[PDB]
Structure formats: C-alpha cells, structure tokens
Amino acid sequence: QVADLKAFSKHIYNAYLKNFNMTKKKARSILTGAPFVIHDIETLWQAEKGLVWLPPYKEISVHVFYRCQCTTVETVRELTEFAKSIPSFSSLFLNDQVTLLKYGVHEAIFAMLASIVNKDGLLVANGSGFVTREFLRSLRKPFSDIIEPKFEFAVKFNALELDDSDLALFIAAIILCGDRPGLMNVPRVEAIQDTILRALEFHLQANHPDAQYLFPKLLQKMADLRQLVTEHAQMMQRIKKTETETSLHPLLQEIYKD
Amino acid sequence: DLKAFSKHIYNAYLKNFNMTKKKARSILTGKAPFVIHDIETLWQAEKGLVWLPPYKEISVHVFYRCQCTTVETVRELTEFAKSIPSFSSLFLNDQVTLLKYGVHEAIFAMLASIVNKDGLLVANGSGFVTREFLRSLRKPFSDIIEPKFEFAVKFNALELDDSDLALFIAAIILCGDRPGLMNVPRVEAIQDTILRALEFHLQANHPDAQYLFPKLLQKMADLRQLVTEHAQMMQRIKKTETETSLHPLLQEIYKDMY
Numbered sequence: 302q303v304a305d306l307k308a309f310s311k312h313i314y315n316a317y318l319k320n321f322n323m324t325k326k327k328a329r330s331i332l333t334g335a336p337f338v339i340h341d342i343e344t345l346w347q348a349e350k351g352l353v354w355l356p357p358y359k360e361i362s363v364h365v366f367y368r369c370q371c372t373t374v375e376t377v378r379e380l381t382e383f384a385k386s387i388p389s390f391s392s393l394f395l396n397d398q399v400t401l402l403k404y405g406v407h408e409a410i411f412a413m414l415a416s417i418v419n420k421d422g423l424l425v426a427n428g429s430g431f432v433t434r435e436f437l438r439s440l441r442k443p444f445s446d447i448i449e450p451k452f453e454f455a456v457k458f459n460a461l462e463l464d465d466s467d468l469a470l471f472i473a474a475i476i477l478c479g480d481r482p483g484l485m486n487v488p489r490v491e492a493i494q495d496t497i498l499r500a501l502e503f504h505l506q507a508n509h510p511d512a513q514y515l516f517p518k519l520l521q522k523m524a525d526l527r528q529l530v531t532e533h534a535q536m537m538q539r540i541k542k543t544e545t546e547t548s549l550h551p552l553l554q555e556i557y558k559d
Numbered sequence: 560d561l562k563a564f565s566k567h568i569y570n571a572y573l574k575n576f577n578m579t580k581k582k583a584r585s586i587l588t589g590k591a592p593f594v595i596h597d598i599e600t601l602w603q604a605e606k607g608l609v610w611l612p613p614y615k616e617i618s619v620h621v622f623y624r625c626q627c628t629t630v631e632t633v634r635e636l637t638e639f640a641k642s643i644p645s646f647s648s649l650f651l652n653d654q655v656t657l658l659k660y661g662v663h664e665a666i667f668a669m670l671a672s673i674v675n676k677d678g679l680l681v682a683n684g685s686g687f688v689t690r691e692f693l694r695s696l697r698k699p700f701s702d703i704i705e706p707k708f709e710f711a712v713k714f715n716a717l718e719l720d721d722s723d724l725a726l727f728i729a730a731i732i733l734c735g736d737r738p739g740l741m742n743v744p745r746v747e748a749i750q751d752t753i754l755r756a757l758e759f760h761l762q763a764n765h766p767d768a769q770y771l772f773p774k775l776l777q778k779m780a781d782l783r784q785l786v787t788e789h790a791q792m793m794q795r796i797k798k799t800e801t802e803t804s805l806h807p808l809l810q811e812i813y814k815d816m817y
C-alpha cells in the first residue's frame with residue numbers, strides 16, 4: 302500500500318496549497334527578509350488606517366481580541382475547505398464533518414500559528430504587518446492571558462523544522478480524530494486517521510531522513526495541542542464570565558458551547 | 560436571473576435525485592413492478608426479484624427498510640442542497656441544522672412522487688408495496704405509514720411536476736426558523752429568493768391554476784406538523800420496541816424534537 306500512501310500524501314498537500322491563504326514557506330521568506338511593525342497604540346492605529354488593513358470599538362485590548370476572532374473565523378473557512386478536499390472526509394455525513402471541525406479547528410489553528418510566528422511576534426494581514434510579542438503581552442488581562450502560551454508552544458513546535466508538506470498531513474490527522482465527542486461513525490474516522498498517520502510516518506522517512514524520532518515527537522505535539530486548547534477554552538470561559546461587554550463571534554459561540 | 564436561479568435548482572434536482580416524478584409516473588401508469596402485498600411476496604422480493612440488522616420479524620424488517628431509504632434520501636438531499644445558490648456559502652454547522660430539521664419534510668413531500676392511493680414504488684421502481692399490506696403491519700410500526708399516504712394523495716392532487724418540486728424542496732430546506740440556526744438573516748434571505756422564484760415559476764408553469772402558491776405555502780406548514788407527529792411516533796417506538804434498532808443518523812435527527 303506504501304505507493305498509495307505517497308499519492309495519498311500528495312493529494313493532501315495539494316488540498317493544503319489550494320486552500321490556505323498563507324504557507325509556512327511564504328511566511329518564513331517574509332520573516333527572513335517588509336511588514337509594517339505594530340508595537341504600540343500609535344502603530345496599531347497606523348496599521349488600521351490603511352498601512353496594513355468588526356464589532357463597535359471598545360478599547361485596545363478588546364480590539365486585538367476581536368481581530369483574533371476574525372482570523373479564527375477565516376481560518377475555519379479554510380480548514381473546512383481543506384477537510385472537504387481530503388479522501389473520505391466528505392464521504393462522512395455532514396454532521397460528523399461538523400463534529401470533527403468543531404473539536405479540531407483550534408488544535409489545527411494553534412499548530413498553524415507557528416508557521417507565521419517567531420519568538421518576537423506574529424505576521425498579520427497577509428504578512429503585510431508584524432505585531433510584536435511584547436505589545437501583545439502588554440494588553441490588559443484577561444486578554445493577554447490567551448497570547449503567551451501560543452507563542453511558547455509555537456517556538457518549540459518550530460524547532461522541529463517541519464515544512465508545508467509535513468504540516469498538511471499533520472493538520473489532516475488533527476481533523477480526522479476518532480475520539481471527538483458525539484462522533485457518529487467512529488470506526489470510519491479511526492480508519493481514515495490511521496491512513497493519514499501511516500502516510501505521515503512514510504512522508505517523514507522520505508522528507509526528514511536524518512531526523513531522530515520525528516514521528517513520535519509529532520504524536521506528542523498532537524497531545525500537547527489538545528492540552529493547549531483545553532487551557533485556552535478555560536481562559537475563554539473566564540473572558541465570557543468577566544468581560545460581559547465584549548462580544549463573541551457567533552461561530553465561536555457554537556464552537557465553545559460545551 | 561430568477562429564471563436562471565430556478566434552472567440551477569432544477570438541474571441540481573435532476574442531477575441528484577435518481578427517481579424523478581416523471582420516471583415514477585411512467586412506471587405507475589404503464590409506459591412493470593413486482594407487487595409486494597404479503598409475507599410471501601416480500602420474501603420473493605428479497606430473494607432477488609426486487610433486491611441490515613438481523614431479522615427480527617416482518618414489521619421490524621419493513622421498518623428497517625424505511626430507515627434505509629431515509630438514509631439514502633438524506634445523502635441525495637445533502638448533495639442537492641450543496642448545489643443551491645448560497646447554501647454552500649453557509650457555515651457547515653448551519654447547513655447541518657437546515658438538513659436536520661428539513662430532511663423529513665422534504666422526504667414526505669417527495670414520497671408523493673412515488674406513491675398512488677394503492678401503494679409505493681420501492682427499489683428504483685422495480686417493486687411496488689401495497690398500502691393494504693403496510694396497514695397490516697404490527698402496531699406501532701403501522702402507525703407511521705398511513706398519515707404519509709393521506710398527505711401524499713392530497714399533495715398529488717396539486718399535479719406538480721419535477722420543475723415545481725425542485726423549488727418546493729429547496730424552500731423546505733432553506734427555512735429561516737429552524738431551532739439553533741446561527742445566521743438566521745442569511746437563511747431568510749435565500750428562502751425569500753426561492754419563494755419568489757417559486758411564485759414566478761408557477762405563473763409560467765401553471766397559468767390556469769388558482770391559488771397554487773399559497774396552497775404550497777400551506778403544504779409546507781402541513782409537512783412541519785406531519786414531521787412533528789412522526790417524530791413523536793418514532794420516539795415512542797424507541798421507548799416501547801427496545802429490541803428494535805434505530806439508525807444512528809436517525810438518532811441524531813430525532814434527538815431534541817418534541
């Protein structure tokens with residue numbers, strides 16, 4: 302079957318290249334040399350006034366929080382199209398497709414954020430802006446609480462030096478997850494995941510021949526991402542409890558609803 | 560535009576439903592199906608003339624075949640809906656909400672296409688099961704069958720064709736007041752376009768018909784009441800026929816209906 306794994310992997314890579322606005326390849330060329338640097342209120346206003354780029358304005362920390370929601374909505378759209386282009390995802394009934402996306406998108410999002418991140422900050426607005434990690438840390442709690450763990454995960458994840466062909470299989474494995482709550486056809490999803498994981502293992506052997514233990518390291522990263530999302534959801538719950546004037550986008554209300 | 564909108568819907572209907580009312584009406588008149596009317600003819604139909612959990616008994620076997628046709632028709636309705644203008648632009652969870660609360664209304668309307676007052680076409684029309692036989696089945700399983708014939712006979716008196724039904728079923732699915740809908744304004748907007756298209760189409764297709772468009776709006780309300788009563792019957796069967804299986808997709812559909 303191993304020669305069908307290579308074609309399986311290539312189909313997933315093509316779904317990735319077709320559907321995601323930013324690749325790690327493009328992002329890393331931007332980050333190595335230019336993006337307008339957002340590092341304080343004045344540069345953020347500059348960036349919004351046209352140099353780089355929503356519910357009614359509230360304050361700076363809430364505004365950034367709203368922009369975080371907008372990127373999640375847009376990435377969910379891309380992840381949905383990516384998943385629909387995956388072998389046998391769209392053969393599942395639509396409710397199973399929604400269940401897999403509901404519980405998988407944030408795990409995928411936080412892994413993909415690593416592609417547009419270095420230790421100093423984050424690419425925004427199609428790579429035309431760069432918002433500094435220090436500026437994001439300087440925001441008001443509880444909003445700054447959600448930021449730093451994602452940088453901490455991303456820097457360690459980027460040390461693995463994956464490329465876009467690796468990430469396409471990695472993201473596919475995150476989505477096709479058999480133990481999501483309320484899944485209808487568990488055996489079918491488990492079977493698809495096993496095929497992706499076998500394809501991923503085969504791909505890493507060819508693409509990273511000298512890398513030690515890369516496949517089990519990635520399996521651990523998938524476990525770390527589930528914990529990262531658990532902690533993130535807890536922080537989102539505190540924001541919902543304590544920041545009642547701050548809006549939550551309807552799509553995110555449905556994702557975080559129990 | 561409005562003609563083109565209708566034509567897109569009609570083509571999606573022809574592309575996705577194998578049995579049209581045109582094909583069915585040829586068979587039912589004489590332009591032949593093996594008649595299933597008792598245990599022996601059903602056995603002959605299963606043995607090869609015409610065509611699941613382990614056999615329990617006659618009434619449960621027919622009940623299982625009803626579930627199988629629903630599962631298959633839901634697959635077709637999903638693909639039909641995905642080809643509707645701006646349905647696919649809805650977020651996937653709203654698509655599922657519309658299908659969850661819409662498929663049985665559409666199914667019972669489309670059953671009229673393959674039904675006369677004497678029975679029902681089965682297995683691509685190769686078989687014809689009689690209303691008398693279905694009435695003879697054990698309670699509570701017989702309880703679900705007769706109200707569908709009652710609706711279908713009166714619905715067939717309107718003499719719609721496949722071009723009409725394509726818009727009618729699109730209107731059923733794109734329904735703005737389904738529980739838990741996320742983007743109600745967007746759905747209401749598509750629904751209003753379909754209803755205008757339906758009225759515009761009926762003027763051309765049935766110029767001499769009196770009050771046909773409000774007649775069809777009332778049929779949509781009748782279908783919602785028919786499904787409410789059917790769902791209550793199905794929940795009682797699930798309570799009283801504990802050894803009878805319910806397909807997982809039907810389990811997810813009827814979950815929260817009252």
Ligand SMILES: CCCCOc1ccc(C[C@H](CC)C(=O)O)cc1CNC(=O)c1ccc(C(F)(F)F)cc1F
Binds near residue numbers: 364368414418432553
């Ligand atoms: C590791 C990078 C920093 C952390 O970024 C995060 C953190 C959590 C989330 C998850 C969101 C939070 C509402 C969700 O729960 O869906 C998204 C981003 C993605 N954020 C953005 O895309 C973003 C976009 C614009 C701006 C800004 F400052 F330019 F406005 C700041 C941003 F963090």
Ligand SMILES: CCCCOc1ccc(C[C@H](CC)C(=O)O)cc1CNC(=O)c1ccc(C(F)(F)F)cc1F
Binds near residue numbers: 621622628629693
């Ligand atoms: C107006 C036509 C008669 C009533 O048919 C009904 C009634 C309710 C339903 C809804 C189903 C019931 C399990 C659902 O809840 O999804 C489906 C059919 C559709 N039934 C079938 O497709 C069917 C198929 C095969 C056979 C038989 F007898 F040949 F086995 C009998 C059948 F009624």
Ligand SMILES: CCCCCCCO[C@@H]1O[C@H](CO)[C@@H](O)[C@H](O)[C@H]1O
Binds near residue numbers: 637808
């Ligand atoms: C195949 C399209 C028609 C499928 C209809 C079945 C929908 O079931 C619903 O699936 C949702 C997850 O997507 C769950 O959140 C709901 O609890 C459940 O009721």
Ligand SMILES: CCCCCCCO[C@@H]1O[C@H](CO)[C@@H](O)[C@H](O)[C@H]1O
Binds near residue numbers: 381399558656
């Ligand atoms: C676009 C794909 C991403 C969608 C993720 C959001 C899914 O939300 C869920 O949608 C279901 C209806 O389908 C509801 O039954 C659930 O209550 C709700 O939690």
